[PDB]
Amino acid sequence: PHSLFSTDTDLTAENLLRLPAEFGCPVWVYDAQIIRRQIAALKQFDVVRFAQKACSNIHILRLMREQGVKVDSVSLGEIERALAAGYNPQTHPDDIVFTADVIDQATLERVSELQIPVNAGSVDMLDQLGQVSPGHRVWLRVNPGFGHGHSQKTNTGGENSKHGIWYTDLPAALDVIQRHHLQLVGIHMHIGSGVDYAHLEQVCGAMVRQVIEFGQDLQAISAGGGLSVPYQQGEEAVDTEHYYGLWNAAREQIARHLGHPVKLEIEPGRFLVAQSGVLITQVRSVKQMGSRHFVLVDAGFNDLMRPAMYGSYHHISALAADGRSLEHAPTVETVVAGPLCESGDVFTQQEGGNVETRALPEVKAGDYLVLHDTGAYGASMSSNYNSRPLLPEVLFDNGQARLIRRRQTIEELLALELLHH
Amino acid sequence: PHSLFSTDTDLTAENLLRLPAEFGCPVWVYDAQIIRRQIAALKQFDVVRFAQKACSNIHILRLMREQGVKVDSVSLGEIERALAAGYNPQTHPDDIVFTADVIDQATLERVSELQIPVNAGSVDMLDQLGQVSPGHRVWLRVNPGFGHGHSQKTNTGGENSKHGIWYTDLPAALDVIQRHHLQLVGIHMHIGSGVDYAHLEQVCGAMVRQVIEFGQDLQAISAGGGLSVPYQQGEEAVDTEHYYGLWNAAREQIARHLGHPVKLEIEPGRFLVAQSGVLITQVRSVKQMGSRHFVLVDAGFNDLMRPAMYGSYHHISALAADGRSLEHAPTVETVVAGPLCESGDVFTQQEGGNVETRALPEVKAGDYLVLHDTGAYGASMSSNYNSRPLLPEVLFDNGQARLIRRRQTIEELLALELLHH
Ligand SMILES: *Cc1c(COP(=O)(O)O)cnc(C)c1O
Ligand SMILES: *Cc1c(COP(=O)(O)O)cnc(C)c1O
Ligand SMILES: [Li+]
Ligand SMILES: [Li+]
Numbered sequence: 001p002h003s004l005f006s007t008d009t010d011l012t013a014e015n016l017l018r019l020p021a022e023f024g025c026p027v028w029v030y031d032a033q034i035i036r037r038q039i040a041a042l043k044q045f046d047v048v049r050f051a052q053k054a055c056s057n058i059h060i061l062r063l064m065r066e067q068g069v070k071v072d073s074v075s076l077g078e079i080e081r082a083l084a085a086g087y088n089p090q091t092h093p094d095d096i097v098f099t100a101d102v103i104d105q106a107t108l109e110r111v112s113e114l115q116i117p118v119n120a121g122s123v124d125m126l127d128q129l130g131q132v133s134p135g136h137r138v139w140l141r142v143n144p145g146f147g148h149g150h151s152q153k154t155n156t157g158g159e160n161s162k163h164g165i166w167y168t169d170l171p172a173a174l175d176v177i178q179r180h181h182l183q184l185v186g187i188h189m190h191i192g193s194g195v196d197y198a199h200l201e202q203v204c205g206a207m208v209r210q211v212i213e214f215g216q217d218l219q220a221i222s223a224g225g226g227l228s229v230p231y232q233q234g235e236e237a238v239d240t241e242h243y244y245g246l247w248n249a250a251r252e253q254i255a256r257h258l259g260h261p262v263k264l265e266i267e268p269g270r271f272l273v274a275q276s277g278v279l280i281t282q283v284r285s286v287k288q289m290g291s292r293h294f295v296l297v298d299a300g301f302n303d304l305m306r307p308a309m310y311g312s313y314h315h316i317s318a319l320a321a322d323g324r325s326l327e328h329a330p331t332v333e334t335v336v337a338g339p340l341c342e343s344g345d346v347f348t349q350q351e352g353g354n355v356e357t358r359a360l361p362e363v364k365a366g367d368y369l370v371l372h373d374t375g376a377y378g379a380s381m382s383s384n385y386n387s388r389p390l391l392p393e394v395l396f397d398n399g400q401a402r403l404i405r406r407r408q409t410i411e412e413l414l415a416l417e418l419l420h421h
Numbered sequence: 422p423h424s425l426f427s428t429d430t431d432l433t434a435e436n437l438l439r440l441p442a443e444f445g446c447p448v449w450v451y452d453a454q455i456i457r458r459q460i461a462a463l464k465q466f467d468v469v470r471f472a473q474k475a476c477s478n479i480h481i482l483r484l485m486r487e488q489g490v491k492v493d494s495v496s497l498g499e500i501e502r503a504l505a506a507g508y509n510p511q512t513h514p515d516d517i518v519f520t521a522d523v524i525d526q527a528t529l530e531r532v533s534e535l536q537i538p539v540n541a542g543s544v545d546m547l548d549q550l551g552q553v554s555p556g557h558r559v560w561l562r563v564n565p566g567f568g569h570g571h572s573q574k575t576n577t578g579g580e581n582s583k584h585g586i587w588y589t590d591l592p593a594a595l596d597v598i599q600r601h602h603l604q605l606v607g608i609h610m611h612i613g614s615g616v617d618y619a620h621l622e623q624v625c626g627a628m629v630r631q632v633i634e635f636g637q638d639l640q641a642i643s644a645g646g647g648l649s650v651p652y653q654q655g656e657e658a659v660d661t662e663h664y665y666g667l668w669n670a671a672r673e674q675i676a677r678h679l680g681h682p683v684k685l686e687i688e689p690g691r692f693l694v695a696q697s698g699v700l701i702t703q704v705r706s707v708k709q710m711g712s713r714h715f716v717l718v719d720a721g722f723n724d725l726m727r728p729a730m731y732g733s734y735h736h737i738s739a740l741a742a743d744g745r746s747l748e749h750a751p752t753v754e755t756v757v758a759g760p761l762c763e764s765g766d767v768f769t770q771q772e773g774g775n776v777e778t779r780a781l782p783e784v785k786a787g788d789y790l791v792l793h794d795t796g797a798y799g800a801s802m803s804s805n806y807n808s809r810p811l812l813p814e815v816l817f818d819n820g821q822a823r824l825i826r827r828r829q830t831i832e833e834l835l836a837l838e839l840l841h842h
């Protein structure tokens with residue numbers, strides 16, 4: 001991640017310390033220019049379609065749209081978010097694509113009404129759509145028979161994945177397409193390769209194979225998402241030119257087979273927004289538990305789910321309350337944990353739950369911690385566990401911080417239950 | 422769990438099938454009498470203090486209060502919930518206890534204002550409270566040096582737990598108590614033993630030891646929570662008389678040492694509400710993925726977190742759309758998964774993420790699935806991941822189903838971001 005004393009971005013030490021006083025704490029902060037930088041790295045692609053489930057604030061969606069980035073919505077709620085951000089299906093039919101493995105009644109009505117292209121990930125879903133919206137423009141999400149990672153575990157592909165039409169179910173999908181006169185716009189895969197370029201090549205190769213074998217005309221293909229970001233010091237960052245080389249080559253083979261140009265979409269979620277965001281949280285309690293040195297803050301896993309749920313790594317920095325530099329202060333092996341009355345609420349833990357320590361300056365109550373690289377799957381995954389309200393979100397742009405989401409209140413949550421007082 | 426064809430409770434087959442049509446789907450359903458039954462099993466205890474983080478709907482809190490059950494709140498939001506349910510600190514000072522390892526400014530002001538007893542789980546927190554509210558009535562949550570489960574992992578006790586004042590920090594806690602003239606009401610432990618009665622005996626024994634060694638007068642002790650429920654067919658249920666025997670014996674030794682009666686609280690969360698609740702979700706897509714038979718429903722891990730996050734088991738039943746019995750229908754090994762565009766959204770998975778199958782009738786789109794025993798840590802843990810709104814909650818009481826929480830809307834979530842339109 002970025003050092004707080006780099007000062008190329010707006011995510012610096014003086015900048016971060018003042019934010020909690022102005023906007024409240026804990027608080028999510030994003031740097032608009034870092035997002036613009038990630039968008040520019042994918043300029044070779046015809047279409048960059050942001051996977052909004054990674055970070056859905058409508059002001060961040062508006063920023064995407066301003067940069068010519070389109071959007072993928074995976075729920076009816078995400079469709080409404082896109083519309084609130086100025087995406088318009090009537091003037092621009094491909095600006096929003098609705099993508100999922102299932103579709104419910106309200107969504108069917110909404111995508112029929114607005115003629116939002118649907119990327120169906122089950123033949124059943126394709127049939128349900130077709131019956132109520134004959135001739136709808138569709139994409140097919142294909143499961144090519146393999147995913148990424150352990151073959152036994154939940155996956156984005158392969159037989160232990162709920163995602164997409166199994167490749168040998170394609171003929172059955174074509175029957176559904178023909179029955180309802182569906183218009184095939186494109187074929188999509190979302191598997192994710194990180195910086196495993198050999199794995200990426202297998203995805204590209206399966207796309208070429210499957211599209212050519214399916215034998216239908218289409219206007220576009222999508223590489224899906226899954227570009228990784230280096231959460232830990234020294235890890236390798238994605239080479240977008242390399243991604244483009246491999247996916248362009250697959251697109252070109254398909255286009256050659258079809259006899260006309262085929263548009264190439266890429267659908268990043270994490271890559272665009274992860275590094276742009278931080279989470280600022282105050283230290284509230286510091287104590288020794290046996291041989292462990294614990295530092296408890298006011299943000300918990302209901303806020304940032306990753307570490308507690310998956311053992312994910314987020315870099316952690318410390319900010320002294322009075323602003324003195326802790327740059328070169330001595331470090332102590334620290335266990336960082338939250339305020340929830342819940343055993344799993346520990347930020348420094350490995351996959352599977354083992355507690356671990358992080359080398360941090362010796363902070364006191366009143367000091368702040370910064371969790372780095374929380375722009376993706378941070379606020380987007382938040383819950384209200386322990387009756388804790390969604391946090392405020394702040395957007396930095398050229399040194400200026402502005403509120404883009406206010407703190408939810410307990411009253412707003414209670415209004416759901418107070419049905420006539 | 423209960424069979425849907427038992428029909429001793431209101432959670433039967435005909436009853437469940439009609440609920441989604443009336444109230445929407447997916448939907449949480451609770452049976453009031455099952456909660457009353459769990460409350461009655463702990464009648465020996467002086468105080469049953471419901472851990473509301475397990476299930477916080479204010480109508481369910483009102484039901485608790487009607488049964489003479491008190492409440493533990495672990496956040497400012499939970500305090501407000503308790504007040505909305507008719508608990509009153511002014512007339513009854515011990516009806517709400519605020520319990521946590523940290524305390525923030527807004528909470529300090531609220532508990533000072535209302536004189537809500539605070540159960541402090543860090544000396545720092547005890548000091549912060551004392552400074553602004555001298556003479557406050559307090560409890561001390563003690564970490565006795567050990568928890569429950571693997572010694573390396575996040576825990577409710579032991580050195581790999583963020584919870585409670587480490588037992589050798591007790592003398593330092595007493596200095597804080599004396600400095601601010603705090604009034605010690607009681608001493609508490611929340612470790613959790615399930616049906617491991619030998620482990621329970623170690624907790625009881627540590628309580629006696631620690632209280633006597635601390636050498637302070639107090640009015641009460643608390644056994645904390647952690648009573649288990651049998652989620653799987655054949656598992657052993659808690660013997661409350663056994664729990665009482667062991668904790669009463671510890672209370673009696675303490676009382677004998679103090680020279681006066683000592684009140685005994687028990688603080689169950691799961692035990693009171695788990696078995697009372699179900700989650701009803703419609704089947705939307707059925708497909709074969711390689712060798713796996715997948716059934717995707719309209720509820721996902723944002724709704725019920727347990728299986729996806731921890732590999733937790735919830736019994737699953739099937740309901741045919743037209744109401745024909747599936748009681749004795751042949752079963753097929755099924756992978757049950759949700760609607761999220763997220764690989765981990767699979768209900769039939771083991772701890773660590775391995776996909777597994779469940780023997781279920783061969784349902785089609787339009788049929789419903791019932792996830793059993795979701796009363797605890799179901800709605801309470803829900804998130805808005807994938808911009809999905811909090812579900813509706815329905816309460817059954819003597820055959821009558823009533824709405825106790827309406828479905829959240831996307832507009833309510835968007836209002837947080839629309840700051841002047
Ligand atoms: C989540 C998701 C993405 C983005 O995945 P990342 O790893 O964040 O890039 C892209 N497409 C679909 C259909 C998704 O569900
Ligand atoms: C969660 C919690 C409980 C209840 O735990 P269960 O396992 O649901 O019984 C009791 N006390 C405190 C302080 C808690 O955090
Ligand atoms: Li897998
Ligand atoms: Li929240």
Ligand SMILES: [Li+]
Nearest residue numbers: 572574576581
């Ligand atoms: Li442990």
Ligand SMILES: [Li+]
Nearest residue numbers: 804809810811
């Ligand atoms: Li939700």
